[PDB]
Amino acid sequence: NNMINFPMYNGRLEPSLAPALIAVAPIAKYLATALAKWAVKQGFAKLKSEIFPGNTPATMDKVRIEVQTLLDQRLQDDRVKILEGEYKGIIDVSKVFTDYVNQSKFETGTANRLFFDTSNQLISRLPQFEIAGYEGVSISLFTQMCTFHLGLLKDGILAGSDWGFAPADKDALICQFNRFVNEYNTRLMVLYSKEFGRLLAKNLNEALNFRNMCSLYVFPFSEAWSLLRYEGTKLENTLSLWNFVGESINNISPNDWKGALYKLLMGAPNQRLNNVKFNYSYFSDTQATIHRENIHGVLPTYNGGPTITGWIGNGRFSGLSNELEITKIKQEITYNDKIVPAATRNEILTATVPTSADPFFKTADINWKYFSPGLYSGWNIKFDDTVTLKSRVPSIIPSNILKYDDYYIRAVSACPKGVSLAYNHDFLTLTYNKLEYDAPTTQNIIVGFSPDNTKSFYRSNSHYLSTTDDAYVIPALQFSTVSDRSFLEDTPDQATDGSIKFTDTVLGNEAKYSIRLNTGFNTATRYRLIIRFKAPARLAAGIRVRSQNSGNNKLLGGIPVEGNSGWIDYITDSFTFDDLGITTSSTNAFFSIDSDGVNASQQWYLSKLILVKESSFTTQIPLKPYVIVRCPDTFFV
Amino acid sequence: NFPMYNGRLEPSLAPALIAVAPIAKYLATALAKWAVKQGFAKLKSEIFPGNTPATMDKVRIEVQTLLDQRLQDDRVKILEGEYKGIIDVSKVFTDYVNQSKFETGTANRLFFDTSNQLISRLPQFEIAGYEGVSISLFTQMCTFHLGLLKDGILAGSDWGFAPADKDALICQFNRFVNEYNTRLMVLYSKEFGRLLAKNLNEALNFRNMCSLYVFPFSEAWSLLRYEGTKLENTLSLWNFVGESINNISPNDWKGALYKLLMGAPNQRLNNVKFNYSYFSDTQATIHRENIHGVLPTYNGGPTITGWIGNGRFSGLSNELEITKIKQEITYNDKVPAATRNEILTATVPTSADPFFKTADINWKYFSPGLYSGWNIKFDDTVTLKSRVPSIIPSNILKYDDYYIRAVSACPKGVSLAYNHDFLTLTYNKLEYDAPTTQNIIVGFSPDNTKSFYRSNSHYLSTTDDAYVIPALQFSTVSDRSFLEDTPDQATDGSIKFTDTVLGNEAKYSIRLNTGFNTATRYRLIIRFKAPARLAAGIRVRSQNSGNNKLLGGIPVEGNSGWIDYITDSFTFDDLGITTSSTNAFFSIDSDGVNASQQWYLSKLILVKESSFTTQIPLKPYVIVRCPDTF
């Protein structure tokens, strides 16, 4: 890698495939239309023509090679043969079923029989796509197969007696859909946890590369599964992608990732970057043979609070007034003729985001290069077309472009080097405590790319609603204010940059979300709010959803919380923005979520709010059967 | 050498025994329930007992002993003449209207003789060059006149006032209740500002005198128009120990120093740290100790505290936190021989009464200047016994019926004019970096504040007719909020709200003591100052476990004075608040404000509907406006 003189793209010799042109993008685009309006008895067939176009495994082959290329991991030749057999089997049985139900006349009893052939084919074959020791590659294949099965079950339930389903048989399908949509999520996160955890210990750069793959090929579909029981929601992905430059880092635990590092990468989650600072040192010897540059710290400053950001690493000058803040010190030293430094430079470098209608960095050219045997080693730092640092190493350091089409640079951070990440987890919060981590150095820079769909919030700090939108998603991290003793929780299966964990035991727990109405908004249209939250223990006073507008506060819903280990979707009663007194000129309007103080066992999570029009939204698959009193067992009959 | 009491050889008079104490006690009674046509006469018996200036003489000598200031012999004789004139004319009036039968027209003329006597003699107590002593005497003569005016208004035709004459007295009351406040603050500001430039310890000693002899009565003026409120003083007393500080400006006091003294204004002290240095030369003749920093840590947020001064070790791993370092150095006879740098910690005991009561803190410079050291002791726990060979005398810091709420210092060697905009109640670290302090400041809060600072909650008793919530005794507060020194409110200060975008709010936690009658009708008095108009006004709410009620929407048209807003009646049943409620709040919120709209919150007063009345209105009854001149 050090002998090769190639322009590089995120540490690779070739530019990566744009996120919008990946093999699974047409499947995600179809699911977005299906989740907004489900085509009854056609939903599964149209999904099948995207997963298995022309009754071929061609798309699942294109997914495998794209993923193998990105991970630089490969399945065994014989395992590929096996998966070909399993695809052929699923295609054979599913073509028979869809050929039958697309005749103008068919027998409902036969359609019922061929449906279950397809369903039990997927139940028995699925474990072939949970491939032990190759979870990184197989998680993207397993994702699509679970998606295929869940789309089949949904279409069968809405089909009813048209495909020979009696009321009691329609109830048995609802019982399986509700069971599988949780079990598949569990079995998905089993694969992700193993591989992410294994790579956190091996190489942080490789771990971020795997999480980036899952952000595009996996987590958009787990979110689609959680929305599949509905019609008239919006499929949205706000996961960020992370690129790593610098010396290797390893031996990170998942607890290290969740407790510290991920909070350190996210900085102020509800704000765009303002400027990032680098603690730079340069060193040259008397003989002009040694030229070494080091980055000892990164200090990202975001557009506002309530999060407080400090040094990751340190901002100290070593090797040289404490109450004075030194930004730069040069030193030239001459010695008696008969490794000692001749020139040293210590500087705080600043990269400032431009103030314009588009206050974001798009691309970056950051690289670190070690020239054997170790005399030269230096850094280039460049955002967009602005050079922050050109290496004072005499030889030229190759370009290392960081970019993703339809993404922009939201965060710049680093991983502390030379210290354990197991400390201060309880005091790395969204407010009050300084989000920092002291280390002797970093010798790495991490860049966070957020998708262009988030540009409107991070530019304005408000959620602008258009009357032409059937649905809008408010991710929990895009808040205006949040209560103390609140944490950022990594919940990637939600296809967001995370959830808010509330832990305050005394005063109470609340997050506010600024909303605006775009001009021409119809304040008479009836809306609903979906609140997704996990609360594993009973709250006596439950969780309150409110609108606040310039002293006019409405209670939109009191959520009864009896305690559940899973994610819950509370749907409010219908309302209009006329009910709330909000207009296209309101400027202090918020949605708010609040609970009382919570003990250790009562600490709960807020994922997102979904605003839907009443006229287009329906629960198509219920949490409980209609007729039968209990779901059957998976036990003996 | 001799033991000292707050830097003096003789102990100071206990706060409960000062000459104005009986006057304050009567005003507390009369503010709960006014005696119609007797209020002025009973107040006269407290200010001029037995028709003598004996109490006003006692006040003068007490305050003179406290400030080490004295009126000239000639000015003393003049005041005796003034007191005689006021007493004689006040006694004639009170004797005549206490007869079985009197003529209303004659009572009317004797009233104006008394009222116009005070108006023409009052400026004799705004003594130029002696405002320090004269402020306490001016305070009582203003109290005397406002008492007479209120009784004139309630007597009406009984003392010969036609409805139009009654309105003119209401016009005079409303003018003078503000004008006397302004003329008081002019005296206070001149003397406080003069002493800040001279000597900070001497300046805090003046504010302490005003917190007992002056500011309780300015608060009493603001409650005199009502009946059924509570008169309360929550001002802290401040004691200074260390090297002299001078050339402080009043702007530095409000903008920085006072905020540093108050620390977390809604919390009790948990621990305080001291940055200590000890130096001893080769000859064992020089022993010097210095205090370079004070770091007070309070019970909780939302305030974040930092070093006042610094926590650095001078004269010696920037990643590791060193708490102590000793050095013994031997040179070649042919400079330091022993040095100690240490972070000392005084920790408040964790008990049913988690407060220091007293302190013994002293700094002594032994001329020629070889010895100089510190003693630091809270209660019976010694934090530092000076390593100077000679014993440093005792310096007892205590106030009967007060306890230690805050420990802080004044930054030495730096200008106090910086970062005023970023010294906030929240978000920003409440610190001020300086090379040293060489002083320690102790804040004593009165025992009436113990309940709140112990529990972080306002417990309400069913047997009490009124309860005062000082603004600084909050649970949570919005960002871009400031502590505002407002000693005329008889509290340790107000909240200033300056957030431009998100909003300004403050919550106060309330609990109900067992046996609380939840069916009793109550009202809330909200004292605020909003100089400019607010389109969405100021909202007052109750919050309880999700149940949130609006208690009042205040219209803010804009006014430069302190405005009291009185909410509509309500029961705790209406709010769903019980004796088992633990999440009950009173809340005050407004929208974002620009620079002109920035407003202040002084206090909330909870009053029973049955015993509360506005006896003196803010506008006349019959005449449309207060009389113009030309």
Numbering used by the authors:
A (entry chain A): 12 to 331, 336 to 353, 360 to 658
B (entry chain B): 16 to 331, 336 to 353, 361 to 656
Cite, word for word, the article reporting this structure:
Cry11Aa and Cry11Ba are the two most potent toxins produced by mosquitocidal Bacillus thuringiensis subsp. israelensis and jegathesan, respectively. Cyt1Aa, Cry11Aa, and co-crystallized Cry4Aa and Cry4Ba. These are produced during sporulation and are remarkably stable in a variety of conditions, but dissolve after ingestion under the high alkaline pH levels characteristic of the larval mosquito midgut. Solubilized protoxins are activated by insect gut proteases enabling binding to gut cell membranes, subsequent oligomerization, and ultimately gut cell lysis leading to larval death. Cry11Aa and Cry11Ba structures maintain the three-domain organization characteristic of Cry δ-endotoxins.
Our MR-phase 2.4 Å resolution map reveals two Cry11Ba molecules in the asymmetric unit. All residues are visible except for the N-terminus (residues M1-I11), two loops (residues S332-C335, and G354-S359) and the C-terminal extension (residues S659-K724). The lack of order in this extension is not surprising given the low complexity of its sequence. We note that the buried surface area (BSA) at the tetramerization interface is 33% lower in Cry11Ba, pointing to higher flexibility; this hypothesis is supported by the absence of interpretable electron density for residues at the N-terminus (332–335) and C-terminus (354–359) of the βpin in the Cry11Ba structure. Cry11Ba crystals assemble from tetrameric building blocks analogous to those in Cry11Aa crystals, as judged by the similarity of their crystal packing patterns. We assign crystal packing forces to two types: those that associate monomers into dimers and tetramers and those that assemble tetramers into a crystal. The BSA which associates monomers into a dimer (interface #1) is 38% lower than the homologous interface in Cry11Aa (1009 Å2 Fig. 2e; vs. 1631 Å2), explaining PISA’s failure to identify the tetramer. Moreover, the emphasis on lattice-forming associations (rather than associations within a tetramer unit) could explain the larger crystal size achieved by Cry11Ba.
